[PDB]
Design a protein around this ligand. Structure first.
Ligand SMILES: [Zn+2]
Ligand SMILES: [Zn+2]
Ligand SMILES: [Zn+2]
Ligand SMILES: [Zn+2]
Lengths: 362, 335, 116, 204, 67, 50, 62, 327, 123
RNA sequence: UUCUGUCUCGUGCCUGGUGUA
DNA sequence: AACCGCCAAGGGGATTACACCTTTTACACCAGGCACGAGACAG
């Protein structure tokens, strides 16, 4: 870039489309069934949901839906998806009714949601907390329907009728929260690398380019608007401001600030660094470097500790000894990072083997 | 014959009138918006959803908003919905309070009429006060009384002073004199020693002149500073002496000089006059001797006469007023 | 109807009897909508420039003059809906003001502005 | 009244009229007493204020402070009835200052708003929007009545003009919990004097 | 996302943040009153009901009545 | 800062450690004087400290 | 999201018009090799080392 | 001139009159611009009286070299007073101890408990205000309004105005007064407290009462906590780079001058009080961010360069600030 | 790569920063080593007050200002003609010169720009 | 009893990244 | 008209939620940023 050799450092982040039951002890929640959800390779930002159990007749389960200004009892979310009876809702959570220990734990949530039964009432309850106050009943309900369809758990699908799949996935997040609360299953570990993915130069650039391209279409919109409101014909060749991608990409790769220059102080810094050409082993290792987005000066040792899960993946010895100790990592000699592939071939093979589609099964 | 203002108080707005709501428009597109909002009103007035707005005010003195009058705020909105320059003032409109409504149609004194006083802004005529005598019915050009600032092509490879028609006729050029009437250098219309050439409307600014008495003779910001001794010369408190404390435009705060009055008093600067007593030491800060200093030797109602300390001359002054070389430079004096 | 709204916001002038704002060519071609039987400024420009002035401040687009406060304060309530000036400077010549008085129309100065 | 008359005598002698301006603080500090405003108005304060606002023999305006404070007081003295304004002439005395050329712009604004405030009642108008009743608005509202995407799209509030007003849509545990809370309080290792541990809220 | 609203614009006089909600949790009823035009509405509430639900019931009654 | 800024020491000494600006504003609003007797005050100025 | 533009109704006919709307859909993408154009527009393959020496940005047009 | 050592220093709020007197830029600073072309403006932000600007040049005010003259102060006469961030919390305390409408202290200085405070806090104003303020918490009426104090020739009551006091609340940078008990059915229960209204209130506080509030009028009179004359720092405090690129303070001052000009112009041509209120809302923001740009909630002031300005508080923030980083 | 010749650095009245007029930072800028707070505290513990004063005043940013004995505000001082005046007091005499570090002058000037009077009451 | 040397201490700044003890 | 009791308010106290400040010394280098669209007048 401008004659400077720049390397994109691989940025680790929590693995999307997966459920993690943590225990944020310093909060009003005994347990938190986090799930940060991301449609497909198809790009949009990841939206995250949290199915928590309050600390404290007690142990009520609440979901934090995207765009919904307040926590909603999960039983209301299931009624909103159309599962009105308590039996039907529990069928998506407590797969084996022969388990009194688990059922006794959902009663507090069925109790909290006793005053709401019909689907439209649950949809209204969610709507009034999502939509702005003056929205009509139809728009407010329809908006809650869209938030549940398109925003909650996008990886499950966003089509017109995914609500049954969504009921099963949300039920699974509650089931797993119950498992963790009962202690039948150990909590998830944030440092276990099976729960981490590395954003290499590809997903990093796709993250910028998505923004710039969306900006480029913003400019074609305002330019053509100026021409077509006057009844004239807007020439798109003038509407495309070439510079937005060119200088956009270039800028973030040059400074390392991974975001729009207008808001530079809000985006990540140092994602792109000047390649170290002092010695060949430094050049090679700089091209094989992993970075943890954890804020420096953090007192917590766990994110910096050599977790057992790094064996053979990350070098156990090569880390800076300064303030970045343990946050900056390096790939092991035979460590490969998957580039990714579409799941459709696998799904087709599974469907032809003896797999019941989730929508078909009792 | 009932006075005009008394017959006016009758029209004032009340709670029962349609409220005047501010909106927010793109600066300089307030008039184009208000008019386009007329076309919108006209287009909808016969359909199933006519616009519920009464009037749209776009004052000239304001720059940033038009105001929509409607009974209920949400009526203003349905009108401004989809209207582009008013897209910024869509989310909120502030009701101008019933007592701050009459002062929306307030106008304080366009002003392009003969026998008026105008000032120049661009060109060589920087900050120059002039007078308009006649306006052409075609309104293509306007006649003005002004004083030239050109050199006449001799300084090139100046202050304001009255024009004279004899020292100019010798430099050359196409000069045509027919007595008291002269024409020169691109129709420089002149009569009885005065120029009458016409000006361009973009270069002359009509408002913000407010002429002083000195202009009346061709065709009062005070020197007060904290610490000045003053005497009230006009109004209810005439002959009160006090010391200035603060100066804020033409508002002056003074500490009255009496054992019986300790509180601060504020007076407009027109109402005060400096005063001095024999033996005070003072500096002239304006006029013919500005920068000179000395002791006051005598005081008269008309003027103070002071003895310049170093140049040792008597020097008369008004009470209202009280680079060739560098330090260390070598100078010859005598040969 | 829209014949009364300014065609273009270039060369705008306000009638000086009723303060209605229209383009110079709109007055010249169609005349003033509110005041024609007492002034007779349709068909010439000499009368137009004598009575009608370009020096006006602010515009009020009057949509319902019958029902509006701004219309009352401004004495335009009995006029046709159109764009009006907030304040127009000037006075009629010493001919039509006399004719108007003779015809029973009390000419009151549209110069609403306060001086300094 | 004594102060204003003495200032008339002093003005004839072309001396500074200090008596009114010397009493002004004491007067302003009392006209502000809410419990006495009725007594003040009914005792003829409007007549005295008219005397103080009135121009002097040489037709000069009173001290700037007097106009500033008396105009501000009049704004804070709203109980004034029409007969009080008409009999005292305070209306004339303020309209005078509003027209007067030597009056400052802020005083002209105060006098202007006073004149509007005092004339509205004459025409039955009012400026307190919270003063119009509920039925008056409901009736007026009837009097004014006329003849794809990949993500959830945020709906926007209803702009509908609502005319019609809708009909309305219409312990044994805490005693034991209080007893247990009292037992908890009773168990505490309290002290008679709360010792300031870090010097905060140190007494005297 | 953000904090839930607790003051509302009177759907009749449109005066901003002029309406407040009193919640009588004992009689199971919410009462909303415009501190400007004094308009009021009352609706049955439940323990889940928040001020935003009352205001919505008011809007739903208005939107249903203004037809 | 909660303990030492509350000490009756001079505003400049306080200002030298945490909450530097607000303590100076506090002193200004209260017209507080600094005796110039500590090591820090004499060091802010170009004076031989005690 | 494909562009959908609808002109602001100017109401000049004095009636509610149906303003024209514009649709654009971005389709196939092509990317050429990294290319350097001299200031006169003459095309040349840009060598990384040239870029490194001349301070260019080794990029391809899209 | 005799050599001297600082035996003592004293802090105080700069009086607006003190500023206008010490300032060299007579008439205030009016022009946002620095140079009208080649030379610096005499009433702009690069006023040569306000210290020297070019190397090997001379200060007009003192003829000192670049390395010798201190920067001489200038001032901007604000059209409408504005609150001083950093004194706002303090103004709220004083404003809640004195009665609105008449500014008398809500607890008479003769009261026994106040006498106790004054007796026990001699030389400790900071502690004094804290204790008297704790007395003026449960006081929602200006007592003794029932009695005429001056007998007009015809134990002592408080002699107040009898008015119910507002409870003042802060919303970022704006102050609001709220009445729960109203004196008159016509009085509005909620008003925006303009800094001009608080200036009127502080001006009326007697010098005895403000000594009670722990503010010696000789050094920190309460109305001086409202910005009505803004001290423009000299060029030495905000020097311009040459390669002239202006400093963050010059840019903020340019904005303040621009709006100050626009605002006084809106007053002269009689714009409505609501235009002014929306404009003072901007002047207030800029004056506040010129001292503290780390203020909570409000949008941080940023140059279109894509970076936040570094205010006077930031210059003293802490590490790398004047005290820690340079003294 | 850590060769000593790329690290060896010495200074004796090199260039000065335009704002605080203190030795510049950095080796290429021909800067001076920072005499940090911990070093100040180490000299305080040593009781070497004259070395401490020299380091933090005489050898960093020595400066003189004229202060009004009546108000402690920095007065105008025209050394060319030896006329000194404190605008505000208008005394034009009864002024005194104080030796204070440039950063301290800087600070008292930043404090006036917040409307704080750090009155240098030398008398 | 034609002249003629006449040159002496200039300077970015912020932010971010990597590295040293 | 007097005294015993319940009712209301005062006020001081108690307990819970939101706002603010701080987060080790120095030292070297590097590279990037440093606002830009656009409209009105003069040889
Ligand atoms: Zn007409
Ligand atoms: Zn100087
Ligand atoms: Zn009071
Ligand atoms: Zn002094």
């Amino acid at each position: 870039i401008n004659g400077s050799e720049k390397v994109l450092i691989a940025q680790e982040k929590m693995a999307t489309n997966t459920v993690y039951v943590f225990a944020k002890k310093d909060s009003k929640y005994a347990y938190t069934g986090e799930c940060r959800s991301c449609l497909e390779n198809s790009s949009r930002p990841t939206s995250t949901i949290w199915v928590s159990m309050l600390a404290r007749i007690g142990q009520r389960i609440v979901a934090t839906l995207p765009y919904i200004k307040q926590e909603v009892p999960i039983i209301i979310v299931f009624r909103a998806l159309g599962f009105v009876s308590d039996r039907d809702i529990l069928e998506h959570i407590i797969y084996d009714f022969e388990d009194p220990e688990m059922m006794e734990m959902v009663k507090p949530s069925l109790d909290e949601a006793f005053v709401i039964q019909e689907q439209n009432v649950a949809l209204n309850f969610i709507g009034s907390r999502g939509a702005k106050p003056g929205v009509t009943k139809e728009k407010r309900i329809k908006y809650a329907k869209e938030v549940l369809q398109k925003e909650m758990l996008p990886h499950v699908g966003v089509s017109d009728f995914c609500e049954t799949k969504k009921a099963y996935f949300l039920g699974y997040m509650v089931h797993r929260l119950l498992l963790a609360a009962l202690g039948r299953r150990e909590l998830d570990d944030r440092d276990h690398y099976g729960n981490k993915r590395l954003d290499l130069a590809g997903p990093l650039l796709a993250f910028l380019f998505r923004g710039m391209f969306k900006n480029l279409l913003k400019e074609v919109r305002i330019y053509a608007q100026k021409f077509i409101d006057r009844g004239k014909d807007f020439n798109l060749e003038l509407a495309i401001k070439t510079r937005i991608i060119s200088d956009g990409l270039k800028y973030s790769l040059a400074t390392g600030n991974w975001g729009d220059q207008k808001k530079a102080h809000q985006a990540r810094a140092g994602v792109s660094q000047v390649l170290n050409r002092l010695t060949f082993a430094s050049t090679l290792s700089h091209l094989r470097r992993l970075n943890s987005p954890i804020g420096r000066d953090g007192k917590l040792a766990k994110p910096r500790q050599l977790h057992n899960t790094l064996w053979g993946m990350v070098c156990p010895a090569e880390t800076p000894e300064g303030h970045a100790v343990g946050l900056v990592k390096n790939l092991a000699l035979m460590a490969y990072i998957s580039v990714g592939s579409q799941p459709s071939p696998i799904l087709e093979f599974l469907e032809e083997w003896s797999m019941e589609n989730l929508e078909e099964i009792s | 014959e009932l006075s005009d203002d008394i017959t006016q108080q009758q029209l004032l707005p009340g709670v029962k009138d349609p409220n005047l709501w501010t909106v927010k428009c793109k600066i300089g597109e307030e008039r184009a918006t208000a008019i386009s909002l007329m076309r919108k009103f006209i287009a909808y007035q016969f359909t199933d959803t006519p616009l519920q707005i009464k009037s749209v005010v776009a004052p000239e003195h304001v720059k940033g908003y038009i105001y929509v009058e409607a009974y209920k705020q949400t009526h203003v909105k349905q009108a401004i919905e989809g209207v582009g320059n008013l897209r910024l003032g869509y989310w909120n409109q502030q009701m101008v309070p019933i007592k701050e409504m009459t002062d929306v149609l307030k106008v304080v004194k366009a002003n392009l009429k003969p026998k008026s006083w105008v000032r120049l802004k661009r060109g060589i005529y920087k900050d120059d006060i002039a007078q308009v005598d006649y306006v052409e019915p075609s309104q293509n050009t306007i006649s003005l009384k002004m004083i030239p600032r050109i050199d006449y092509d001799r300084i090139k490879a100046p202050p304001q002073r009255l024009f004279d028609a004899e020292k100019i006729r010798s430099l050359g050029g196409d000069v045509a004199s027919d007595g008291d009437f002269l024409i020169f250098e691109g129709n420089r219309y002149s009569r009885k020693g005065f120029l009458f050439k016409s000006f361009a409307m973009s270069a002359v600014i009509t408002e913000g002149v407010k002429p002083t008495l000195s202009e009346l003779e061709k065709f009062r910001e005070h020197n007060f500073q904290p610490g000045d001794n003053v005497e009230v010369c006009e109004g209810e408190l005439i002959n009160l002496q006090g010391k200035i404390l603060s100066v804020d435009g033409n508002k002056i705060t003074i500490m009255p000089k009496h054992e019986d009055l300790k509180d601060m008093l504020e007076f407009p600067a027109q109402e005060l006059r400096k005063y001095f007593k024999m033996g005070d030491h003072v500096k002239v800060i304006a006029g013919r001797f500005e920068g000179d200093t000395g002791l006051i030797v005598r005081v008269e109602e008309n003027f103070v006469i002071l003895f310049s300390d170093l140049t040792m001359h008597e020097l008369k002054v008004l009470p209202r007023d009280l680079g060739q070389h560098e330090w260390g430079e070598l100078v010859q004096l005598d040969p | 109807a829209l014949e009364t709204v300014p065609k273009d916001l270039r060369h705008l002038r306000a009638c000086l009897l009723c303060s209605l704002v229209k383009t110079i060519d709109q007055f010249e071609y169609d005349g003033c909508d509110n005041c024609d039987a007492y002034l007779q400024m349709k068909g010439n420009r000499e009368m137009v420039y004598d009575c009608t002035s370009s020096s006006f401040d602010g515009i009020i687009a009057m949509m319902s003059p019958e029902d509006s406060w701004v219309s009352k304060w401004q004495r335009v309530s009995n006029f046709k809906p159109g764009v009006y000036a907030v304040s127009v400077t000037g006075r009629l010549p010493q001919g039509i003001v006399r004719e108007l008085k003779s015809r029973g129309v009390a000419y009151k100065s549209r110069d609403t502005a306060i001086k300094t | 009244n004594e102060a204003a008359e003495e200032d008339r005598q002093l003005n004839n002698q072309k001396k500074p009229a200090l008596k009114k301006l010397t009493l002004l603080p004491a007067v302003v500090m009392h006209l502000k007493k809410q419990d006495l405003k009725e007594t003040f108005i009914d005792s003829g304060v409007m007549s005295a204020i008219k005397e103080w606002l009135s121009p002097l023999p040489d037709r000069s305006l009173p001290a700037l402070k007097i106009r500033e404070e008396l105009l501000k007081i009049l704004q804070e003295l709203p109980s004034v009835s029409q007969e009080t304004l008409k009999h005292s002439g305070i209306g004339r005395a303020v309209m005078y200052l509003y027209k007067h050329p030597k009056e400052s712009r802020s005083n002209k604004d105060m006098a202007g708003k006073l004149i509007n405030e005092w004339s509205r009642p004459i025409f039955g108008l009012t400026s307190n929007y919270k003063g119009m009743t509920r039925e008056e608005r409901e009736q007026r509202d009837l009097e004014q009545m006329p003849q794809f995407c990949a993500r959830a799209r945020v709906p926007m509030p209803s702009n509908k003009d609502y005319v019609v007003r809708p009909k309305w849509n219409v312990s044994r545990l805490d005693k034991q919990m209080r007893k247990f809370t009292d037992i908890r309080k009773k168990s505490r290792s309290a002290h008679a004097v709360k010792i300031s541990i870090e010097g905060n809220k140190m007494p005297l | 996302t953000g904090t839930l609203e607790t003051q509302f614009t009177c759907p009749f006089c449109n005066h901003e943040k002029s309406c407040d909600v009193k919640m009588d949790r004992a009689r199971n009823t919410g009462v909303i009153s415009c501190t400007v035009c004094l308009e009021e509405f009352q609706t049955p509430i439940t323990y889940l009901s928040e001020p935003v639900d009352v205001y919505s019931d008011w809007i739903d009654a208005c939107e249903a009545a203004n037809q | 800062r909660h303990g030492v800024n509350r000490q009756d020491t001079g505003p400049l000494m306080k200002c030298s450690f945490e909450e530097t600006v607000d303590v100076l504003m506090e002193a200004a609003a209260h017209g507080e004087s600094d005796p110039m007797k500590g090591v820090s005050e004499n060091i802010m100025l170009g004076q031989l400290a005690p | 999201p494909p562009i959908d533009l609808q002109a602001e109704a100017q109401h000049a006919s004095g009636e509610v018009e149906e303003p024209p709307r514009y649709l654009l859909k971005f389709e196939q993408i092509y990317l050429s090799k990294p290319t350097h154009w001299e200031r006169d527009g003459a095309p040349s393959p840009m060598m990384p080392n040239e870029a490194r020496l001349r301070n260019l940005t080794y990029s391809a047009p899209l | 001139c005799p050599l001297r050592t600082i035996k003592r220093v004293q802090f105080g709020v700069l009086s607006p009159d003190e500023l206008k007197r010490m300032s060299v830029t007579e008439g205030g600073i009016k022009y946002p611009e620095t140079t009208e072309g080649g030379r610096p403006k005499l009433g702009g932000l690069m006023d040569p009286r306000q210290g020297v600007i070019e190397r090997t040049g001379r200060c007009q005010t003192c003829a000192g070299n670049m390395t010798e003259c201190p920067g001489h102060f200038g001032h901007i006469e604000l059209a409408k007073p504005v609150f001083h961030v950093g004194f706002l919390v303090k103004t709220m305390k004083v404003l809640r101890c004195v009665c609105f409408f008449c500014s008398k202290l809500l607890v008479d200085s003769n009261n026994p408990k106040i006498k106790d405070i004054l007796a026990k806090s001699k030389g400790q104003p900071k502690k004094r205000l804290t204790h008297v303020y704790d007395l003026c918490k449960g006081k929602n009426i200006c007592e003794g309004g029932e009695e005429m104090d001056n007998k007009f020739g015809v134990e002592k009551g408080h002699g107040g105005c009898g008015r119910y006091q507002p409870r003042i609340r802060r919303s970022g940078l704006e102050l609001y007064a709220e009445w729960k008990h109203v004196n008159e059915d016509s009085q509005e229960k909620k008003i925006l407290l303009s800094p001009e209204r608080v200036h009127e209130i502080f001006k009326r506080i007697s010098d005895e009462e403000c000594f009670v509030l722990g503010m010696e009028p000789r050094y920190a009179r309460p109305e001086w906590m409202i910005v009505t004359v803004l001290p423009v720092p000299p060029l030495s405090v905000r020097p311009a780079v040459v390669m002239r690129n202006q400093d963050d303070l010059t840019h903020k001052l340019a904005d303040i001058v621009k709006i100050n000009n626009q605002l006084r112009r809106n007053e002269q041509n009689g714009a409505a009080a609501h235009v002014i209120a929306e404009d003072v809302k901007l002047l207030q923001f800029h004056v506040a961010t010129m001292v503290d740009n780390e203020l909570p909630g409000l949008p941080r002031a940023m140059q279109k360069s894509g970076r936040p300005l570094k205010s006077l508080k930031q210059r003293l923030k802490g590490k790398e600030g004047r005290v820690r980083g340079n003294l | 790569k850590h060769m000593v010749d790329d690290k060896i650095h010495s200074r004796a009245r090199g260039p000065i920063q335009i704002l605080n007029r203190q030795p510049m930072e950095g080796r290429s800028r021909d800067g001076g080593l920072r005499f940090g707070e911990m070093e100040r505290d180490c000299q305080i513990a040593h009781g070497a007050a004259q070395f401490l004063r020299e380091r933090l005043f005489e050898a960093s940013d020595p400066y003189q200002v004229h202060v009004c004995n009546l108000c402690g505000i920095m007065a105008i001082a025209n050394t060319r003609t030896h006329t000194y005046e404190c605008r505000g007091c208008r005394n034009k005499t009864q002024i005194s010169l104080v030796r204070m570090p440039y950063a301290c002058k800087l600070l008292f000037q930043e404090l006036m720009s917040m409307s704080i009077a750090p009155r240098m009451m030398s008398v």
